[PDB]
């Protein structure tokens, strides 16, 4: 009857609350994805039980073992019903699980750490202007 919904700990999708240790069930977590799961289960009449994935991974097929892990492994082997999480739609995943339409767009990006001269008086004019002024 009750439907288990796998997910992963990731800001701002699923977060532990400030007093999560004093709370039990879906009240422990907060974020974008818990609200998304709440709205989804409000639309289709189901009662859900959020469950963080055991190994804390998103899902990949082992080249040799040929066994999925993460949330894709949770879904493939019947240990979960719905994966409300930042799970990317990919060709390798689409062949083993069913993805709904995208609920958020994104892309791969590079993250780096954040980070005037003595002749700054020479700046408000272009170098060509200075050369032409001398000429």
């Amino acid at each position: 009857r009750t439907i288990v919904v796998t997910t992963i700990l990731e800001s701002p999708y699923v977060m532990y609350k400030k007093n999560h240790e004093q709370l039990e069930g879906n009240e422990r977590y907060e974020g974008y994805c818990v609200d998304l799961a709440y709205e989804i289960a409000k639309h289709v009449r189901i009662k859900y039980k959020l469950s963080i994935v055991g190994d804390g991974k998103y899902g990949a097929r082992d080249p040799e073992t040929k066994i999925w892990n993460g949330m894709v492994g949770e879904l493939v082997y019947g240990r979960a019903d719905i994966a409300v999480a930042p799970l990317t739609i990919t060709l390798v995943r689409e062949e083993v699980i069913d993805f709904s339409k995208p609920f958020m767009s994104l892309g791969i990006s590079i993250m780096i750490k954040k980070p005037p001269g003595v002749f700054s008086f020479l700046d408000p004019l272009a170098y060509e202007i200075w050369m032409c002024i001398v000429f």
Partner: protein, 45 residues
């Protein structure tokens, strides 16, 4: 210092990485573009 992925791939003093099992890792793994192939070779090695 860095403005594109090509600049990141050409340089050597600044390393780069990603998640072990996530869509970016397999994106670089099975990419057929020269710059992304170079980046995958660097990250694998």
């Amino acid at each position: 210092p860095i403005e594109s992925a090509e600049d990141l791939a050409k340089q050597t003093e600044i390393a780069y990485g990603t998640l072990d099992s996530g869509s970016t890792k397999e994106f670089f793994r099975r990419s057929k573009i020269a710059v992304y192939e170079k980046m995958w070779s660097y990250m694998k090695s």
